[PDB]
From Swiss-Prot, chains A, B, C:
Changing residue 137 to K: Biologically inactive. It comes from Homo sapiens (Human). Changing residue 77 to F: Biologically inactive. It is found in: Secreted. The lineage of its organism: Eukaryota, Metazoa, Chordata, Craniata, Vertebrata. This is Tumor necrosis factor, soluble form. The gene is TNF. The chain holds residues 86 to 233 of 233 of the full protein. Residues 3-148 form the THD domain. Residues 1-148 are extracellular. Disulfide bonds join 60-92. Coiled coil: none annotated. Signal peptide: none annotated.
Length: 148, 148, 148
């Protein structure tokens, strides 16, 4: 009877993090809505909120890239946006003047925490570079919430 | 009264990820069974499932290595296996022709999510290279589940 | 009615990991106490415990550094300390004799698990180098617990 959601990246969405519950082993029950790529809370309460993203690259080309993942809360019904959880990662410290190269790298980021939410609040799980995501398979990219 | 399990790597198992509840601060209660290195669910319901693995290496020898960690579900009572959560990590982008070397590196991977399971389902937390694991101590390698 | 806490790093504490509940989107309710920078459990029970730390550096200066994060339990009322969850990470495999340099790097560590605690137990989330932390913003550094 608890509101719950476990949504995954839609692998047909090219260059975007599009969440989807249309998968076996994914959930969107008891009031939680997926609207505008956001999770809308059905009741006020304490919620465990979490998400994982997986980035992938092929070597460290010429310069440098920071990868971010954040879960924001947008309170009320069109109020402000505020970050609840956030992480940053840098895949390449270096890779310069020729030689050999071109080795793929993978980098997972996990975020998870317990928060007091009000009915109607909207949650967003967002990354800066959707073009570096890897949802080539599995339980590699996901976002969920469960009322506690 | 909720089914629950928090098992750790058995440090006496050389080159294998062998789960064990025989530790203070580990749990295996209310129906959850550890059978064939797998966690068997006692009732249908929503479960928070999670696991951490820690890999360790001593420099980046000649070529390259990918480290994987996945939690699969094997539904029913001898049905198919399917991945619920998965992560990949690459420890070495490089390390070639002589010089100095040989610095140990550590890499943790965390997986966690909420899933609807049926009684009898079996859960596996698996890695590709058990020879790179580090459970030299602590709460470094663990796998748990708790009915929500 | 469940004991719960979600505390964040206090950004005014220079070179120390000082936890604080004095933030919107932070919690310290139903009996959980923040005493001596530790979370004191109000009742015996199963608790989901978790924490994230984010380290940041500016290149890989001359030698090497290991970053640790651990959550310990200190049972009873002045008994022993024991690690429940722990992770290690090494930011620099290399960076030697001149050239160019000086690129900032970020490294997040996440810990989370379910544990049977007794009333009065104290929990500590600790790092080895508080001088490498980054709580420059957001939900970057946090420690929470919720009775299950």
């Amino acid at each position: 009877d608890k509101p719950v959601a476990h949504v995954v990246a839609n692998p047909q969405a090219e260059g975007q993090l599009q969440w989807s519950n249309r998968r076996a082993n994914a959930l969107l029950a008891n009031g939680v809505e997926l609207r505008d790529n956001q999770l809308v809370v059905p009741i006020e309460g304490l919620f465990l909120i979490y998400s994982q993203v997986l980035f992938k690259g092929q070597g460290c080309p010429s310069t440098h890239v920071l990868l971010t993942h954040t879960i924001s809360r947008i309170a009320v019904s069109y109020q402000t946006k505020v970050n609840l959880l956030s992480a940053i990662k840098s895949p390449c410290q270096r890779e310069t003047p020729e030689g050999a190269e071109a080795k793929p790298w993978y980098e997972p980021i996990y975020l998870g925490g317990v928060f007091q939410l009000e009915k109607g609040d909207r949650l967003s799980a967002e990354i800066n570079r959707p073009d570096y995501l890897d949802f080539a398979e599995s339980g590699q990219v996901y976002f969920g919430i469960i009322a506690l």
